[PDB]
Design an enzyme around this catalytic site. Structure first.
Site, PDB file in Angstrom:
ATOM      1  N   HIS A  41      38.720  42.080  32.391  1.00  0.00           N
ATOM      2  CA  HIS A  41      39.168  41.484  31.182  1.00  0.00           C
ATOM      3  C   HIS A  41      39.671  42.495  30.176  1.00  0.00           C
ATOM      4  CE1 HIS A  41      37.496  37.167  31.547  1.00  0.00           C
ATOM      5  NE2 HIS A  41      37.889  37.606  32.721  1.00  0.00           N
TER       6      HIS A  41
ATOM      7  N   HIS B  85      37.257  38.541  43.487  1.00  0.00           N
ATOM      8  CA  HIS B  85      36.402  37.368  43.881  1.00  0.00           C
ATOM      9  C   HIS B  85      35.685  37.577  45.246  1.00  0.00           C
ATOM     10  CE1 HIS B  85      38.455  34.653  40.634  1.00  0.00           C
ATOM     11  NE2 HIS B  85      37.891  35.727  40.109  1.00  0.00           N
TER      12      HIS B  85
END
Ligand code: HEM
Ligand code: HEM
Ligand SMILES: [Cl-]
Ligand SMILES: [Cl-]
Ligand code: NA
Ligand code: NA
Lengths: 714, 714
Positions: A78, A245
């Site tokens: 992020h 992921h």
């Protein structure tokens, strides 16, 4: 609440963005140099501490699966993920995730906890490691701890001490779906420039699908467009998403109404944390971050090839998380995914809508299958794309610090060849300047060309500038603002001067075309001073090199094209934002203060730097002479200004008594006579005692611009 | 528009007010010294230019009666008239009328014209005369030119380059009548502190009467209240109002709906001007400024005592101007007042409701009759009041520059006696510090006493500070914050050390108590450093003098009482504004940046500077030792903070695991662990590498505070 100038005149221009980041707000001394501090850090010691932290669970935010690695990978991703290629703004490079608004964006929920887990290390090593570097290094150590070998790491991101002024959008509601009164979308799902996210407060896309519609194929469209706007192509995007992921989990253990105020809205007793949850224990097994409840792999704390094995080995059924979010579950699968806290509990494989895009978009499917079949290729691609992600805003390799910097030169780093020969000295620079002036190039050509070369620099991601001589390459040589035909004539004359100088040298001495562009710019400024009767020397520092066309990615250079450059009174088309707003935005990317922007523009006007030789703002009768005429004539109350009939963005200046036309200007010109703070600056340079100050201030700002990208001399 | 942090979190604290006035926004170089420039100005040549300008009409704003004097007196009275005694903010001293919001206040309508008439002189003399000084000097020259003897003039107001952050009120509509959702009045017409005007965008009062009601007696109450809040008593108020209204005229030749946008809302072609009028020619005889249409005297361009002759020689009838404003006309008088443009036209005497206040308020009436009967007394009062008006925010007389400074020392100047003896040298200061420490006074006493003396300074009007030793006098010696009984014990011990040192000297050398209080504070900070294991010297500069009680106006000092001092964790009562907001307000009056505020508060806490030896924020186990413990303990995630039962503004810090009570703090303490920018500063000083930095930065800010009022050394 105390009413401010912003309340009364909400569309007046905002100069405070040019004076952010003063020595006033900075706690470090004015001499502090982060590079030097970081070069003395024991980086291996920091990494040992970060390894220890991975599994040192704190009760106020227990580690999933006993390992914070997923949480830290998200944190890093992020930090980096706010980057937009359109202005260079965002990215990890200034550590802004610790300041408003990004500390409180919904997509950053519980990253406050991640950062606070890092406080002890930060405290122990102090100024020798910035937060900005620490967020990225922690991401890297999380990867290594979990078995993934990184491509490397560079330090040198200095911390900043207040929020950056960035346009993140005009919506007034967090996460507002498209088509509202301030929609960032129009037409056939066209995201407005410079934005690179689909909703206010998200990093890229909505994990349930576009405006919450769980269609993986249409989600793919949003993924491709946002990641492209973050400088990532299809291979890099698939590698990053599937790579990331491979680790960790999402958090959506109950309804979102349980979650309280974001950090900037929380009470003083929350001591900088937010999103306190009233659901069960509020944390760990009960955590709520996004609302989704997905764990991707059978070993979330270890690198594996399991993400693509699951993605392709099951068929997927739409379902809802415990918070009510759309997500997908594997048809008919056994419960093979471990639980993060209960060793007796297992789960079926699950995926986000945006994970399925990797399979159901036809172009991503081909890459995803290839990575499925060739996991070594997936590993190498993810390592490379993780490095790009986390370094894309750091600028030229000369800024990369420490012992883990990758030796490989990558195309996205806009690389400049090393200089391997003696540089020209002061005598040589005088001889070249005399040759340039004897060739018959004009002050206007010389200044315009150097300006064009150097003013592509932006401080946001430290891309652009004169180093590289990329002005001679595609695409910069064809940009309308650069005046291609005039440019081509200047470069040919300079290349001949160059060829002749280099051919006469002994030893290996030579001059690069990059240096010679900048030097000739300097000669033009000296000549313009001489034309005004002033004896001025302009500083010059050699050492620029020439990059080749193959070291210059044409598609990546497109975002540096100036579509608005008030310093050359150029606007490529009509924009919603007024042209003076665009000028201050460009001044900010160039690192200029308001006084510097003012001096620079006044000088450029009278030197002939306007595109097309436009007379707009040329308030002098001695063009190509370096004088303060722009200011003296702008401020003359003898002249009355009115918008023209044909064009309300062009103004005519007429004698107030006779009616006679004296001048014309644009909004960029006249804002210096209108805005009360700019006009105060203009007054200083338009006063009778100011000619020498104006010359000296002009040369200083000219030199500053010419050296913006000179990190080899930093 | 772009959504900002202010939009998302409109009640978060705003640190940007501490970082205005950076070298970034300043076009002068970092070495520019205005006093040096002003001292070489030929002030008599400027005044001769100004004198000529008074009668040199420009057609874009023709001079009433052929003379701009009235216009320029009003300009100067509004530059000075924003001043509020409560905070010292406003006034003429920084030339703020040329920036937003003041440039566009309704009560400043057409002063933009005034200021533009002065550009040519500004331009001629450049940096040697600030706009700030020029606005004032022009008013003086206008008075002189029309036959009035001024009391004097001091230069030295340096220009500023951006708007000050000032609370002007909470209304969102210009001129909003009282009793709205953001009413600045409550109770029995109680104007909220720190305001000094009755409606947003007015200088003092509404010339029609309170919220437009034309009752002179009630208007008199608003006059008295607002002028008092600008530090003017009844005699000075009558002299100023009648003095001013001896000259010139008001402007209200037609309806107000003819008047366009104020300068900050006007188009870019208006070049910084505003209020363009569609009524007939828009200017001269057709001008509209206030809406009132009053000419007070029979010679508006000459000093006279005709204002009181008219006020008392006629009876007055309520009437309406051509813009519909209430105003008053002389019943049955002849047309004896000249017209401003037509020598064939004459008018009856007229007055504002607020002019009639001077006759119908019974206290004002006695002064106004005395001035009517004794116009030389009126002239003296007005001259003295005009000097006070235009100088009240300039600070100590040591700042006054130029050849017209009045020699008479006035009580409002908080005068400091001259020093006429040798000062103590470095060896003497070392001897005195050792004596102070050997007397038995503690670190905590020494630091709290010096802090209390020095921290009265406010940079808004440059009042306060340790010079004068007024801490020993009424009223300061009795202020609750200063801890009167403890203060008296300290001062007695210091006065004995002083008497003994001065008794032992030869050759005239002596030390003032003001210096010794500051020196003893320095000794305390050195000893606290010693106690932490650190040898530092705190700088000290002698030369302060002791002022007497008779040289101290006790009523005027009232506004300097700290009722909120977060640096001593002190709040005298409950305020609507959170205590952290009050802290940043004090830091701004002290001229501190956010890093200086943070260092200073952290240090003060651990030195025992809290009022009443409150333990709030005392996060150390070695009180009286200069360490960074405040920061290390505040930032320790091992401690959990909660508001107490009794008081929601006091927090307990308990160990997160055991529940054990470790600390207590206020909002002022805990903001440093909450607000995202202040916590980033706290982190620097709470780092393991920060002890030396902490000490050095603390010493630096301590010495800065001690010297705030030392303009004798500027
Ligand atoms: C289309 C792009 C992406 C979307 C829509 C997205 C969405 C999300 C969401 C919703 C979560 C759950 C937050 C929570 O509830 O705790 C998350 C977790 C995570 N994401 Fe992504 N993601 C994206 C790309 C990335 C990338 C590029 C990386 C890194 C290379 C990444 C790494 C992570 C990791 C490691 C986690 C787990 C965190 C944990 O264990 O606490 N993701 N992602
Ligand atoms: C109760 C206090 C005051 C009120 C309500 C008041 C009100 C006004 C108003 C409404 C105007 C007309 C503005 C226009 O239409 O052009 C004005 C004019 C003026 N006022 Fe005042 N005033 C006050 C005090 C002062 C003081 C203290 C001075 C200076 C010592 C001053 C000097 C003047 C002058 C010289 C003009 C004439 C301007 C011209 O000739 O263009 N007034 N006043
Ligand atoms: Cl940014
Ligand atoms: Cl102010
Ligand atoms: Na950036
Ligand atoms: Na002030």
């Amino acid at each position: 609440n105390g009413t401010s100038n912003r309340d009364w005149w909400p569309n007046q221009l905002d100069l405070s963005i040019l004076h952010r980041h003063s020595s006033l707000s900075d706690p470090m001394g004015k001499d502090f140099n982060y590079a030097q501090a970081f070069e003395k850090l024991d980086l291996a010691a920091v990494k040992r501490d970060l390894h220890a932290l991975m599994t040192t669970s704190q009760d106020w935010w227990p580690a999933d699966f006993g390992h914070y690695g997923g949480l830290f990978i998200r944190m890093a991703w992020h930090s980096a993920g706010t980057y937009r290629t359109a202005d260079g703004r965002g990215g990890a490079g200034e550590g802004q995730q610790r300041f408003a608004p990004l500390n409180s964006w919904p997509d950053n929920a519980n990253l406050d906890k991640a950062r606070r887990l890092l406080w002890p290390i930060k405290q122990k090593y102090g100024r020798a490691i910035s937060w900005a570097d620490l967020l990225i290094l922690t991401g890297n150590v999380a990867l290594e701890s979990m078995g993934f070998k990184t491509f490397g790491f560079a330090g040198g991101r200095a911390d900043t001490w207040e929020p950056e002024d960035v346009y993140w959008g005009s919506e007034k509601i967090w996460l507002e779906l498209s088509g509202g009164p301030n929609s960032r979308y129009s037409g056939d799902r066209q995201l407005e420039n410079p934005l690179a996210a689909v909703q206010m407060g998200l990093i890229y896309v909505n994990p349930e699908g576009p405006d919450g519609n769980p269609d993986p194929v249409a989600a793919a469209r949003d993924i491709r467009d946002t990641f492209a706007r973050m400088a990532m192509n299809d291979e890099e995007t698939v590698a990053l998403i599937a790579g990331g992921h491979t680790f960790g989990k999402t958090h959506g253990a109950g309804p979102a109404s349980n979650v309280g105020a974001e950090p900037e809205a929380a009470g003083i007793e929350a001591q900088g944390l937010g999103w306190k949850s009233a659901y069960r224990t509020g944390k760990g097994a009960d955590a709520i971050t996004s609302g989704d409840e997905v764990t991707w792999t059978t070993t979330p704390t270890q690198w594996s090839h399991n993400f693509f094995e699951n993605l392709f080995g099951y068929e997927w059924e739409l379902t809802k998380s415990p918070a009510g979010a759309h997500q997908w579950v594997a048809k008919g699968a056994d419960a093979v995914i471990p639980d993060a806290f209960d060793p007796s509990k297992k789960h079926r494989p699950t995926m986000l809508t945006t994970d399925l895009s990797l399979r159901f978009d036809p172009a991503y499917e081909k890459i995803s299958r290839r990575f499925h079949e060739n996991p070594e290729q997936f590993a190498d691609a993810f390592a490379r794309a993780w490095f790009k992600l986390t370094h894309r805003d750091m600028g030229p390799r000369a800024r990369y610090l420490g012992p883990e910097v990758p030796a490989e030169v990558l195309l996205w780093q806009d690389p400049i060849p090393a200089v391997d020969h003696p540089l020209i000295d002061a005598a040589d620079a005088a001889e070249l300047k005399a040759k340039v002036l004897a060739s018959g190039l004009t002050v206007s050509q010389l200044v315009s060309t150097a300006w064009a070369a150097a003013s592509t620099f932006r401080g946001s991601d430290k891309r652009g500038g004169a180093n590289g001589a990329r002005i001679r390459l595609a695409p910069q040589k064809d940009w309308e603002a650069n005046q291609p035909e005039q440019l081509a004539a200047v470069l040919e004359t300079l290349e001949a001067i160059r060829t002749a100088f280099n051919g006469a040298q002994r030893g290996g001495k030579q001059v690069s075309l990059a240096d010679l562009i900048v030097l000739a710019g300097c000669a033009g400024v000296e000549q313009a001073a001489k034309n005004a009767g002033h004896a001025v020397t302009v500083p010059f520092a050699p050492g620029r090199a020439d990059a080749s066309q193959e070291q210059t990615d044409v598609e990546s250079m497109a975002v540096l094209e100036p579509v608005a450059d008030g310093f050359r009174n150029y606007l490529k088309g009509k924009y919603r934002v007024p042209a003076e707003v665009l000028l201050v935005d460009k001044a900010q990317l160039l690192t200029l203060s308001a006084p510097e922007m003012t001096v620079l523009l006044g000088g450029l006007r009278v030197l002939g730097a306007n595109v097309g030789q436009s007379r707009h703002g040329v308030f002098t009768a001695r063009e190509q002479a370096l004088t303060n005429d722009f200011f003296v004539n702008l401020l003359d109350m003898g002249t009355e200004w009115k918008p023209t009939a044909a064009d309300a963005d062009v103004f005519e200046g007429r004698d107030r008594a006779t009616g006679e036309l004296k001048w014309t200007g644009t909004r960029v010109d006249l804002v210096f006579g209108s805005h009360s703070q700019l006009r105060a600056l203009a007054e200083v340079y338009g006063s009778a005692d100011a000619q020498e100050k104006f010359v000296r201030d002009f040369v200083a700002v000219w030199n500053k611009v010419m050296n913006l990208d000179r990190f080899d001399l930093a």
